[PDB]
Write a protein that binds this ligand. Structure first.
Ligand SMILES: O=P(O)(O)C[C@H]1O[C@H](CO)[C@@H](O)[C@H](O)[C@H]1O
Ligand SMILES: [Ca+2]
Length: 448
């Protein structure tokens, strides 16, 4: 067969069956043969296995003559930023994002933090590793320990005018992932009062997997916000490349509406910029980008596609409805920290709550949120939906699965590139009853 840990965008597996130290080391040797010249930046997340996997990966790399720069415990965006900042040949983050306790993985980038996908070298690494039968060589290169985050921190703060910031009260929920360490390093430079929930890094995840979409993690943050009268709350996944917002009532804000709002914040600083967005949910983003003088640029979802469209278009900002936010000045990479700094500045400067900033957008373009399906025949399921609606003549688009625009409502339906699921997203023009009917009706066609 082929190695199962090698997914489309990255390496995800169960330790030690699909991913282990010998596989990691072999990945190190194979990566040395794919990169242009320069050192390799390594980082890892809080998971229990992640240091041992990094040590193995460093050994394979140094056996093949690449210097390693170990930046230690970190979030995924720091490997991206440090790879670009230090002009390294590439970087590797050991992490399993939001996945179960027995999982780990790796995200790989080349120069300027460009992603390595199955498309673009990750499957060439897989093939090399699959065949590499050789014995581990000895380290012929060094490992430098570069744990200082000053440049990263200074970079993050540069997005906001610190003298316009009000002493807002913010709940932060790191889910025992790694985000609280960055918060605690920024706190001395910010006027905010932080209310820290599930703050300490703990790879045993005592309070559960860092995944804010799970209702127990959701309710922990929503409750902290109401109990403390915070202005809003922020929660991250384990490696904090995803950021989720809660308004002052404790209400979870669908990542879709943050794309348009962050867009407007950015185009206030860089007028006439291009903004990259995905096709799942579109109408609110397009109108807000245009209202702000920007240019909306549609792109297939998935972080490797977004980053490339942004480079090739010189887009100032890009956003997915799955809580990934991308910034040109951040090596065209995603950050889970920049978003909430931008929102904090917006609230401070406008005198508006986060709830009021999004309220009218949510009523103007209600959406279903992402709904996932395991079905028997994904093709036959999709066929049934298209059959049922063909007599209404929807405008179709195949940029990313199927988008069907009916005028007053639309949906996107697409297979996942990382799970064997169908993902559904629906939205209407200010009609919540139509939203519910069409979402139930489509759900029925899918399952039946
Ligand atoms: O499983 P999917 O939908 O193909 C890909 C999923 O993970 C990616 C990487 O975190 C995200 O960029 C994407 O928006 C998300 O839907
Ligand atoms: Ca993540």
């Amino acid at each position: 067969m082929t190695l199962p840990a090698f997914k489309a965008y990255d390496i995800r597996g169960r330790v030690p069956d699909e991913l282990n130290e010998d596989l990691a080391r072999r990945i190190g040797v194979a990566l040395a043969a794919q990169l242009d010249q320069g050192p390799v930046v390594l980082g890892h997340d809080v998971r229990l296995a992640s240091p041992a996997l990094q040590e193995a990966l460093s050994a394979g790399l140094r056996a093949s003559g690449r210097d390693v720069i170990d930046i230690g415990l970190c979030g995924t965006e720091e490997v991206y930023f440090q790879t670009d900042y230090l002009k390294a040949a590439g970087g590797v983050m050991v992490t399993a994002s939001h996945n179960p306790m027995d999982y780990n993985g790796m995200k790989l980038v080349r120069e300027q933090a460009r992603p390595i996908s199955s498309d673009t070298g990750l499957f060439a690494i897989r093939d090399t590793v699959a065949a590499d039968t050789a014995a581990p060589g000895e380290p012929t290169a060094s490992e430098q320990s570069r744990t200082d985050k000053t440049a990263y921190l200074e970079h993050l703060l540069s997005y906001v005018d610190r003298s316009t910031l009000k002493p807002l009260k913010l709940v932060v929920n790191a889910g025992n992932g790694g985000a609280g360490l960055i918060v605690d390093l920024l706190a001395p430079h910010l006027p905010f009062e932080f209310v820290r929930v599930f703050h300490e890094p703990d790879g045993n995840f005592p309070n559960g997997i860092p995944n804010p979409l799970l209702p127990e993690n959701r309710d922990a943050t929503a409750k902290a916000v109401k109990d403390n009268g915070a202005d809003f709350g922020i929660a991250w996944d384990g490696d904090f490349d995803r950021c989720f917002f809660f308004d002052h009532t404790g209400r979870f804000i669908e990542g879709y509406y943050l794309v348009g709002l962050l867009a407007q914040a950015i185009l206030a600083k860089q007028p006439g910029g291009k903004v990259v967005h995905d096709p799942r949910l579109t109408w609110n983003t397009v109108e807000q980008v245009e209202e702000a003088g920007g240019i909306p640029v549609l792109c297939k979802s998935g972080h490797a596609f977004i980053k490339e469209k942004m480079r090739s278009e010189n887009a100032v900002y890009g956003g997915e409805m799955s809580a990934h936010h991308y910034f040109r000045e951040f090596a065209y990479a995603d950050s889970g920290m920049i978003p909430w700094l931008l929102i904090a500045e917006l609230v401070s400067q406008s005198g508006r709550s986060l709830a009021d900033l999004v309220e009218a957008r949510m009523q103007k373009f209600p959406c279903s949120g992402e709904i996932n399906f395991k079905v028997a025949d994904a093709k036959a399921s999709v066929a049934r939906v298209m059959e049922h609606y063909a007599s209404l003549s929807p405008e179709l688009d195949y940029t990313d699965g199927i988008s069907a625009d009916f005028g007053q409502w639309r949906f996107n339906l697409r297979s996942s590139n990382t799970e064997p699921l169908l993902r559904l997203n629906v939205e209407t023009r200010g009609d919540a009853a139509l939203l519910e009917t069409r979402t139930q009706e489509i759900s029925n066609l899918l399952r039946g």
